[PDB]
Amino acid sequence: TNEETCDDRKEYMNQWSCGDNYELCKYNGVDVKPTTVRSKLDGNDVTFFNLFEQWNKEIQYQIEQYMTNACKEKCKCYKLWIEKINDQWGKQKDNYNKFRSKQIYVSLSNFLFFSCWEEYIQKYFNSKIKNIGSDTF
Amino acid sequence: KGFCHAVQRSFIDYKNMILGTSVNIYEHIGKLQEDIKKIIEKGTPENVNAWWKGIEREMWDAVRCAITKINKKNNNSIFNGDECGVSPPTGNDEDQSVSWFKEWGEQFCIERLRYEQNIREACTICINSKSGDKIQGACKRKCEKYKKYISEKKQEWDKQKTKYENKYVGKSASDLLKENYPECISANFFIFNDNIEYKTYYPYGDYSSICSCEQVKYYKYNNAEKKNNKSLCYEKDNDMTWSKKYIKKLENGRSLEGVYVPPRRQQLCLYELFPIIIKNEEGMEKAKEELLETLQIVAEREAYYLWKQYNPTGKGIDDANKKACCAIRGSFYDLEDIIKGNDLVHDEYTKYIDSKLNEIFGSSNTNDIDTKRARTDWWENETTIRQLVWDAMQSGVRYAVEEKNENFPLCMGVEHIGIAKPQFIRWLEEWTNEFCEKYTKYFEDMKSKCIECKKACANYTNWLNPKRIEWNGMSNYYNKIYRKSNKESEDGKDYSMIMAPTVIDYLNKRCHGEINGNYICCSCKNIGALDLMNEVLNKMDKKYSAHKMKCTEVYLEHVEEQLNEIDNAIKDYKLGC
């Protein structure tokens, strides 16, 4: 219904799609070829996780334009992207847990905290060495 | 004027004083706050916040009652809750520092306007000068008082601004003051110059204007003497990134993105135009020769600075000289665009410059497009202006040559050049050039290091990471504006002059050749073996796959150790004879 009348609005453009072995996520019309070089981290498995990393980044970047998001069509498209992002985040969490299971020998909480502070340390600094702010903390 | 503002300030001060925060302005505030807390926490049990939220409505009603009754006793019409804000001010900016900074800036703007008016009145009779025409009695003393006032406001504003920026990193104080109070759009935070030359060469900084009258004329290359560093501004940088902000917002629905300011453009010397414009505020339509002299000065200075700073960066005299010629060509193109006002940046400099140009060229009712046409033909007219600026740039580059004791490059040596491409295309091609150079440097360094290239690989990957969003941005912008014959085009620029349905085709066919200064300014081959960089954007390419495992392993190790560092740091951040 509103999917066709809302895609042409070229406002959301959720490029990433996660779609069975690992629930591969595809950024755009580019095929995924795992270049294996190799029950801990090994082979193409880590590469999959690496892909998820970029997804994570754009997810935060997503919020950016959604902070620029603000009648009936707008609300319907808003709920539509909310559902899309919810299911995509659920699938990414599930395949991350599968990665952790294959990487038994970082818990989606400490690692995400480190990434969201890496955003800060990279936007201005490089600088991941000193903590002498005492006011920005 | 400014009454309900004072009421809001006082109410905020009472609200934040009644409960213990960073307030010590009085002879003591801690005593009163401690007594209030001791009184409150005996019957109520925190409870202070609940009590304040309970009584805030009554206090606001009380102040409304007070204003209503005081205007009732007044013989004029009895007022009502019509004062600014029927509700107490919101909590978005209830910080004491923010409010104090805002009021300080507002009063500084008002007094600066007052001093400007006083100078204009007392120095209106350079012109009508009585003499070395430095002795005036009232004018000199007034601008000296302004000088001392600015001297103290320098350190005051420095301290307040650094505190605010540290507290709210990610914003800018100058823009906040500009938007909150439109009373000072002419304000240019240059008044608080740090260079000693701007204090001694400029006797009054921003006001080396009418209080000082010299009428110094620009000295061409034929003149052996120069401006003796009249506007010797700071040198530009070479390792700073692009900017996504400072783009005009046509509307919230569109919110066009993907446009970024090139590093070279955002490091531009344009300091000297503001004081000379302030000096020549009087004398409309007859000081354009002074404007021409000033723009020749600034063009020569920026060309000399660019050649002095960029030429040593690289021992490849040939291609470095060609790249410098292309860079100064692009600088001239941007200067021509801002002369005609065909740019997208809207900072405090460009906004003021375009306002002044519009009020100068536009007599009484000329349309915006009419003013664009008038300034374009004036720039193209000969007395051409874009031959005088070309000769000034040649003079500056020749000064750089004789200072460096080198030869005159073949590039830019032509006395005439053609009409340039739209600035978006130039920004895109120079972005591709710098990306290619950085990739060639980083990949070569990583290959040379490897066993130890883990740091080099980290540098390469953290340089590559920001480029994906950049690529997506201008690709998406190009896909929405390409091939439009100025009828349905997004702007007034005559698009559809590039035969390329896709950006990859044009970047492949555009500058896959000589890096000389004529049109084609790239030199990049053996990269695809031109289109494989997309597969290098994401970490699946064959070339990176050789070191991918080692790079991701060392990256994860660094992630773990830095996680430990940050968590232990945040735990530690709890606190005669």
Side-chain angles (χ1 to χ4, degrees), chain B residues 277-431:
Chain B
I277 284 169
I278 290 302
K279 170 65 177 69
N280 63 55
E281 284 310 312
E282 193 267 321
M284 61 79 71
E285 279 283 341
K286 68 96 175 179
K288 300 196 168 187
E289 73 275 20
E290 299 304 318
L291 312 174
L292 172 70
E293 297 273 286
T294 51
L295 56 89
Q296 287 167 294
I297 289 153
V298 74
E300 174 184 2
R301 298 328 286 127
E302 64 87 21
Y304 160 70
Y305 298 154
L306 190 46
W307 215 268
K308 168 65 65 64
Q309 177 200 13
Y310 181 75
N311 207 7
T313 58
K315 278 74 177 175
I317 306 301
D318 44 352
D319 63 356
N321 274 11
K322 307 296 107 173
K323 284 183 262 150
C325 284
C326 301
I328 65 183
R329 260 184 163 193
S331 76
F332 159 70
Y333 303 150
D334 279 338
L335 190 149
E336 169 167 8
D337 295 326
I338 71 191
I339 287 299
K340 310 163 180 176
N342 289 1
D343 211 352
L344 301 193
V345 294
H346 280 95
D347 68 335
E348 94 288 355
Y349 279 154
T350 45
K351 220 169 207 295
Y352 179 78
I353 284 158
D354 68 55
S355 62
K356 301 316 281 293
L357 269 294
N358 287 322
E359 61 89 20
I360 281 163
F361 263 67
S363 50
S364 57
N365 265 331
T366 44
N367 205 9
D368 52 351
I369 183 56
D370 190 282
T371 50
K372 299 289 95 176
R373 211 178 320 108
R375 66 201 296 164
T376 294
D377 66 52
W378 187 87
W379 169 262
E380 299 287 337
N381 268 317
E382 79 286 348
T383 59
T384 75
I385 317 289
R386 53 164 318 281
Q387 184 63 222
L388 311 169
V389 303
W390 186 254
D391 291 23
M393 289 190 159
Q394 286 161 313
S395 68
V397 73
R398 284 191 195 94
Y399 272 137
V401 175
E402 54 90 14
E403 187 155 346
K404 290 274 199 183
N405 303 313
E406 64 179 359
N407 69 84
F408 188 78
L410 189 141
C411 59
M412 181 285 318
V414 294
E415 215 61 35
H416 178 77
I417 53 160
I419 298 104
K421 288 178 186 279
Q423 73 271 39
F424 159 63
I425 312 295
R426 315 202 294 275
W427 298 343
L428 172 63
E429 56 88 13
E430 65 205 4
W431 175 89

Side-chain angles (χ1 to χ4, degrees), chain A residues 64-100:
Chain A
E64 302 169 350
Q65 70 267 15
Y66 287 175
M67 295 298 102
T68 78
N69 188 265
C71 60
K72 302 286 100 175
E73 40 190 354
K74 299 288 95 176
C75 165
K76 283 197 285 284
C77 293
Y78 207 82
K79 289 194 176 76
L80 188 152
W81 81 253
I82 286 173
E83 291 137 355
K84 281 168 39 194
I85 294 303
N86 212 311
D87 65 61
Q88 284 140 6
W89 177 42
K91 294 181 283 278
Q92 280 282 35
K93 161 184 54 183
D94 298 327
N95 56 59
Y96 173 87
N97 294 116
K98 292 202 286 293
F99 181 76
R100 191 81 197 95

Side-chain angles (χ1 to χ4, degrees), chain B residues 192-206:
Chain B
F192 322 99
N193 267 339
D194 53 88
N195 196 309
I196 178 58
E197 174 258 326
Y198 283 115
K199 309 189 203 78
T200 176
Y201 194 93
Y202 293 74
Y204 318 102
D206 205 353

Side-chain angles (χ1 to χ4, degrees), chain A residues 104-121:
Chain A
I104 180 59
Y105 198 73
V106 74
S107 76
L108 199 49
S109 305
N110 297 114
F111 188 83
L112 285 193
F113 170 77
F114 169 83
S115 63
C116 69
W117 280 46
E118 184 70 27
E119 162 203 5
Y120 181 76
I121 203 65

Side-chain angles (χ1 to χ4, degrees), chain B residues 115-313:
Chain B
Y115 283 166
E116 164 62 30
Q117 171 76 6
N118 194 5
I119 290 293
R120 179 63 38 78
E121 293 147 335
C123 314
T124 184
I125 206 68
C126 49
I127 188 167
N128 298 122
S129 280
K130 264 79 72 176
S131 314
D133 47 352
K134 63 99 176 179
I135 187 66
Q136 297 294 277
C139 187
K140 45 182 301 301
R141 80 178 184 176
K142 290 325 176 181
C143 71
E144 277 294 330
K145 301 148 168 259
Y146 175 88
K147 162 188 175 70
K148 270 79 74 176
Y149 182 77
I150 296 316
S151 159
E152 51 89 14
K153 281 320 180 181
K154 162 104 168 161
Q155 43 85 30
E156 196 162 82
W157 161 76
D158 285 325
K159 206 150 283 197
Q160 298 196 14
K161 178 186 193 173
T162 184
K163 154 73 181 198
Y164 159 76
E165 293 296 334
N166 263 21
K167 175 59 214 80
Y168 291 167
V169 59
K171 274 78 68 179
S172 67
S174 48
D175 291 331
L176 176 80
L177 272 296
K178 289 276 211 325
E179 60 91 11
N180 282 119
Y181 312 120
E183 325 309 313
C184 50
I185 314 300
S186 46
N188 175 24
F189 314 107
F190 167 63
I191 314 165
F192 322 99
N193 267 339
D194 53 88
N195 196 309
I196 178 58
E197 174 258 326
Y198 283 115
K199 309 189 203 78
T200 176
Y201 194 93
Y202 293 74
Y204 318 102
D206 205 353
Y207 276 175
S208 300
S209 166
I210 180 69
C211 190
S212 172
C213 300
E214 287 307 310
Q215 311 293 326
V216 189
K217 295 298 296 190
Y218 156 70
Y219 299 139
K220 198 62 180 174
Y221 198 79
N222 65 346
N223 305 113
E225 90 279 356
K226 216 181 183 299
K227 311 314 287 164
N228 50 76
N229 302 319
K230 174 176 302 297
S231 76
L232 192 73
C233 62
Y234 314 80
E235 276 291 338
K236 320 297 173 57
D237 206 16
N238 282 113
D239 45 356
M240 61 79 71
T241 185
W242 300 51
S243 158
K244 201 182 47 185
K245 306 289 107 176
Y246 292 165
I247 303 310
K248 58 192 274 207
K249 198 63 63 69
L250 72 164
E251 67 262 10
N252 185 271
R254 263 276 175 80
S255 81
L256 60 91
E257 293 299 323
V259 297
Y260 298 80
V261 178
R264 51 100 182 171
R265 190 264 177 276
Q266 47 194 350
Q267 50 204 359
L268 191 52
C269 184
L270 72 164
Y271 292 165
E272 48 270 34
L273 58 88
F274 196 85
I276 190 56
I277 284 169
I278 290 302
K279 170 65 177 69
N280 63 55
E281 284 310 312
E282 193 267 321
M284 61 79 71
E285 279 283 341
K286 68 96 175 179
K288 300 196 168 187
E289 73 275 20
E290 299 304 318
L291 312 174
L292 172 70
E293 297 273 286
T294 51
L295 56 89
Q296 287 167 294
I297 289 153
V298 74
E300 174 184 2
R301 298 328 286 127
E302 64 87 21
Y304 160 70
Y305 298 154
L306 190 46
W307 215 268
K308 168 65 65 64
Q309 177 200 13
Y310 181 75
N311 207 7
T313 58

